[PDB]
Design a protein around this ligand. Structure first.
Ligand SMILES: Nc1ncnc2c1ncn2[C@@H]1O[C@H](COP(=O)(O)OP(=O)(O)OP(=O)(O)O)[C@@H](O)[C@H]1O
Ligand SMILES: Nc1ncnc2c1ncn2[C@@H]1O[C@H](COP(=O)(O)OP(=O)(O)OP(=O)(O)O)[C@@H](O)[C@H]1O
Ligand SMILES: Nc1ncnc2c1ncn2[C@@H]1O[C@H](COP(=O)(O)OP(=O)(O)OP(=O)(O)O)[C@@H](O)[C@H]1O
Ligand SMILES: [K+]
Ligand SMILES: [K+]
Ligand SMILES: [K+]
Ligand SMILES: [Mg+2]
Ligand SMILES: [Mg+2]
Ligand SMILES: [Mg+2]
Lengths: 524, 524, 524
């Protein structure tokens, strides 16, 4: 279609105005005294959120050039959310400050490319300084503090996330889901448990609980669908001779084979239960091999070479306990070699490193959590769905922040880390004066998060920023209590990964944005 | 016509928005780093001004409630200009700050009447504290500093005004008018000189200069129009017998009498000049009596009792020198009793105290300046008419500020005096908590002038305000040099009358404005 | 009415856009290769002009803020036209360059007041440097060159103006009026000649020419209206006894006195002519006294003291020749004392110095030209009225430029003088860096006239400006021939007053304009 074209100051002013609209919508949420934003939904009730990425995503402007600026700056929050799952508001505030100061420098006649180069150099040095300033976050107290800060000073969320991390260890997988009550609950499942119930309700050994309970049972892992009993007959004879129970994880058991297994279960000759193999094609075999390694057994398939008829007792896996319910099956203390389990876990880790998808890598992380460590589910407790959504967003932010803190350490919160980093970079210089001004605007923008936090408290950002800059180390401003002190001591910890990602993404987008001389958009 | 009626928060928000429009237009001019405002004129070129009263006068808003707020707050600048001729921008900034904080308090549910009472109490205490803090401004250096500060750091204007004040003394009258050259000129006329030229060009004793020059002449003061020579004949005979020149200040000389005076002037029998009596009905007699007192003579009139025929040499006044030009007549060193001159000056001062009009009181002040002291005219030098208007406005501001400083003393400039006064009133309390909040909002608004001055410099108002508050006495912030120091030492002096008037008028208007619950205006 | 208020960058951009509209309309006329502008007239034919003041006056913009900028910058051209009668386009180009560079500096964050101070300091130093660089323009060749350059390389206009200046001398008065033919004519009248014809056609001594010619006649100067012959009778008897002719310059001769003068003229007893006294009340007496001084006579009036009855031959004036036509009367070689004539001329010069009106001062300048020197009229020759208007404007520009060159000297034309002055001011510095930038923008704007002259030629302004700057002295660029050389040698002379006035007025308006932060205008 026909295009509206704007140049120089007018285009830059409109882009800055759109950026300011989005950033003003987002910055009101920053900090302990940050407020909430209501986002209208065409289908459903409005959403109340403190997450700056949601606010940024909902922002779209009528003016095409202002909307261009808003959409360009929305990428900062989107990338911060995709990478660190937190710091999106800080990223947006940083991007807005960089854009404002860089456009001021451009209006002063300096070369925008050199300003962008100076910003990039300052941010690279800043990332190095943040890495130097980061301290490890390994104790449960620090993890709880990080979760509490990320959950908007919600101590319960931080304590729950720290407890979940302790229960599931380093290799465990933690997810957040909706709850039914008003209180947040933590459900931790250890060892292996897959969402595959019994193939027949008649298998239930314990009627009062409706769950098959097998003590020290054999494990028959079949990678092929089973419909007849001829293939499985010798295994059943061997199991009955042994006298121990049997659990058959198969692709599908149905028809005559299921029926005769049921009759044999009541007749007491063999206490046998059958469950479906978890997963689907090209992934079900992986879980079957994982269960075989955990239980010290072997998978029966056409591709591997042997058939179910020739399966023996040594072929079958071994486990201390097995519990089957209507939906899930749990194998407790599988009798398998620890070295093989560790090797398979390392192989899955290597595939995760080779993985290029978030969903896939999460699936193999869950597989690792089943093989070693545990799986935790945090059920968010709330009275209404709007409160559920807000609290779940905060809990997800806290979970992401705790993971980032465990991975890359922690720094002083409340924008103090960026203050200290910018103070450490006062002597940084570029190739020319324009690059020096770019470095200076990056350093000044590094103070924007603390200033916005203070402004959201109703205090004077300049006075508090000067007081924090006059301090050293982890000295800073507790905005919740409006008091100065050591941010590590008061538990205001920011994940180093979150701060670094916010700075990097804001810098990239804003440095590209300050170099713009012409905008081309659709005519109104 | 039909009326739009608004209540409570909506009306107050619209009023505050209009106030903010006017105050934002006006505050950009505040301080040494204040900028200029262009005001469009329907007939003529646009006017560039730094005077906040002009900007406030030009402001009128489309929205009727916003316009109501703007018009109400315009009264602050108008009253400051009418009273002190300076501080209108400071008055407007103070009024805006009081309105903003008082509306914040009203939105918090406190009684607006009690807030207004607290504001009034705080401002009364503030005026008392300003009176206590004021130091006399009598030396020429302090007067020049006040004029320089009021003229936007124009040292030449301050020095010129100090020189004019020194030349014309305490009782002299100084006016400002347009000039012809590019430089500001000072024209000081001492003793008595009235804008009445000779009644005939033939009276000129000195053709090379075109001015009658009479050395030790007699003075004939006639309060009646003269057309014949019979009434004036014996006076002419006595003057010719004496041999000294004669100057006739009359209501009007014309016809035969003027002709025979002309012939006698060339014939050398009597060197006589005739001029019109300055002023008009009920005021010309006053100037005639003033000249009679100065020259030790008597006025001839029908009402007093004697006629011109019976006038003698003792009736005539005496002066050392008389110079008549085409437009003005000057009497130098009139031979009159000093005690009578002082008594007449005191009588005119008493009438000035009894006077209730600015134009009238200025007229008798000019009469006093003719009788004693001098009259100074400052011709503003500029290249163009727009520059002439701007510089003349600045020079008028400096003249008003110097007069106010002479009258009521000086305090630290740059909003420092209000800072110190507000600090001295921290313990002030009202009858109830709402009055205490009113006192607090008045004290906080007292910091608005310094904060706006700093903001106009591009610096951080909060940091500089805190630094100034941490100081004591005349410690403050030179915004021109952006350095801290003693404002009296650096010559940043504010007239105490100007600061007090700004505070009082802002307080009155803003305290009345924060009490408004309903607005009634015309429908759009 | 309701007001539209704009702030900062938006207001400044609109003001600059309006300034650019006016300056783009005006700059196309600059220089020898400047084109013409057509200005529409509501009543009458369109006007084709090269004068930048006319173009600036006709400019008015729909957008109120753009119109504000245009009206403000129009003052530069108006003031240059009022002061020097030339250089209005140069003044406008200078003002536009200063505004553009100063707004660039303001957008860079420097203090506009300090930029204005730096501009003013640079322009004061520039005026001093122009005074130093100026050389006197006294020879007829230089005057003709100045007139030719000012008349857009019209050699005939320059030669005619030089001839008029030579004929009327220093004290003569030159005016420009419409002609009847296609060629420019010069009519020079020496001695005294006033536009007052004979009071009766019967006075004509020479019927073939219709003009009274009196050889060595007496001069009777009467300041009163004459209607009877009794008052004038003894003068007539004395004149008839002497036998020489008589010319009566009177307020009015009519009725019986005129009739008997007519009869006596034909009867040959006395060859007498009567003319009306030139001028009106309070000015006719001045011309009568001038004629009396020139002819060595005395004016008869009631105020002076003597009557027409007592007038004698010695009272009457004397002249060598008198020529009366239907409209004008000329007195050739009046027999009067040279010292008295010089004294009266000096007195009129003193009144001119005391005069404060252009029309009045021109009237007394014409009186001086009648008393001493001569009066020249340049009748502009053109085929049509549009060509007449254009050529008359050019001739008026040339006359003003020649007067300015005679008064204050000449400098190198084509913007070279401003180039050299700016080069001489490279070391000039202000109090702070912002004042230094103001000085720099003034110096850069000093190159705008030459650059615009070159651009109007279709050449590269930057290359030619660099070449001229690389030269020294009067080296520069002849744009008419597009060749480099000595501008004085090629006759491209600019009056120093014109260049200085253009720079000063442009500087004042533009320095005030760059300090503007807010504009208030009427809503659309
Ligand atoms: N009590 C506190 N005192 C000072 N700063 C605090 C306090 N609590 C949290 N902060 C700071 O507030 C910031 C976190 O604010 P917030 O969670 O609103 O935004 P975010 O992390 O940038 O983004 P998101 O909207 O994605 O959660 C961090 O810089 C953190 O250090
Ligand atoms: N160099 C300076 N440093 C600090 N403050 C200064 C300086 N020069 C002037 N001021 C302050 O600026 C104020 C005067 O500013 P300005 O003249 O713009 O406004 P005003 O007096 O309120 O009103 P008006 O518009 O009627 O002149 C005073 O408070 C004065 O003390
Ligand atoms: N042949 C030439 N070569 C170079 N410069 C020239 C030449 N002739 C004239 N100029 C220059 O052109 C300028 C005069 O141009 P112009 O008459 O169009 O404008 P102006 O004097 O600024 O204003 P106005 O419109 O009032 O006449 C002067 O600077 C003069 O020196
Ligand atoms: K947030
Ligand atoms: K002001
Ligand atoms: K021109
Ligand atoms: Mg967060
Ligand atoms: Mg002032
Ligand atoms: Mg010209």
């Amino acid at each position: 279609a026909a295009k509206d074209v704007k140049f120089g100051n007018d285009a830059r002013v409109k882009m800055l105005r759109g950026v300011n609209v989005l950033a003003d919508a987002v910055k009101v949420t920053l900090g302990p005294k940050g407020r909430n934003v209501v986002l209208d939904k065409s289908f459903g009730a409005p959403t109340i959120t403190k997450d700056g990425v949601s606010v940024a995503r909902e922002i779209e402007l009528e003016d095409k050039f202002e909307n261009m600026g808003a959409q360009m700056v929305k990428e900062v929050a989107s990338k911060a959310n995709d990478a660190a799952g937190d710091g999106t508001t800080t990223a947006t505030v940083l991007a807005q400050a960089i854009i404002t100061e860089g456009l001021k420098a451009v209006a002063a006649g300096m070369n925008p490319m050199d300003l962008k180069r100076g910003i990039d150099k300052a941010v690279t040095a800043a990332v190095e300084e943040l890495k130097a300033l980061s301290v490890p976050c390994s104790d449960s107290k620090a993890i709880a503090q990080v979760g509490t800060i990320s959950a908007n000073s919600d101590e319960t969320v931080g304590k729950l996330i720290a407890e979940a991390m302790d229960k599931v260890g380093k290799e465990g997988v933690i997810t957040v889901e909706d709850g039914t009550g008003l209180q947040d609950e933590l459900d931790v499942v250890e060892g292996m448990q897959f969402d595959r119930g019994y193939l027949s309700p008649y298998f239930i050994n314990k009627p009062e609980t409706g769950a098959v309970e097998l003590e020290s049972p054999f494990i028959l892992l079949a990678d092929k669908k089973i419909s007849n009993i001829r293939e499985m007959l010798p295994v059943l004879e061997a199991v009955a001779k042994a006298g121990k129970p049997l659990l058959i994880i198969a692709e599908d058991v149905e028809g005559e084979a299921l029926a005769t297994l049921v009759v044999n279960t009541m007749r007491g000759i063999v206490k046998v239960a059958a469950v479906k193999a978890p997963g689907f094609g090209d992934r079900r075999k992986a879980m079957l091999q994982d269960i075989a390694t955990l239980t010290g057994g072997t998978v029966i398939s056409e591709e591997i070479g042997m058939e179910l008829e020739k399966a023996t007792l040594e072929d079958l896996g071994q486990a201390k306990r097995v519990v089957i319910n209507k939906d899930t099956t749990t194998i407790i203390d599988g009798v398998g070699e620890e070295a093989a389990i560790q090797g398979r876990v390392a192989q899955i880790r290597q595939q995760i490193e080779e993985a290029t998808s978030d969903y896939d890598r999460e699936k193999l992380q869950e597989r690792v959590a089943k093989l070693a460590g545990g799986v935790a589910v945090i059920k968010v407790g709330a009275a209404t769905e709007v409160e559920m959504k807000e609290k779940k967003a905060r809990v997800e932010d806290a979970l992401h922040a705790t993971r980032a803190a465990v991975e890359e350490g922690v720094v002083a919160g409340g924008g103090v880390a960026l203050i200290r980093v910018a103070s450490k970079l006062a002597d940084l210089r570029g190739q020319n004066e324009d690059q020096n001004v770019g470095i200076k605007v990056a350093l000044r923008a590094m103070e924007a998060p603390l200033r916005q936090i203070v402004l959201n408290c109703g205090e004077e950002p300049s006075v508090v920023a000067n007081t924090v800059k006059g301090g050293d180390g982890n000295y800073g401003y507790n905005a919740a209590t409006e008091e100065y002190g050591n941010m590590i001591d008061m538990g205001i910890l920011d994940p180093t990964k979150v701060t670094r990602s916010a700075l990097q993404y804001a810098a990239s987008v804003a440095g590209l944005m300050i170099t713009t001389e012409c905008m081309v958009t659709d005519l109104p």
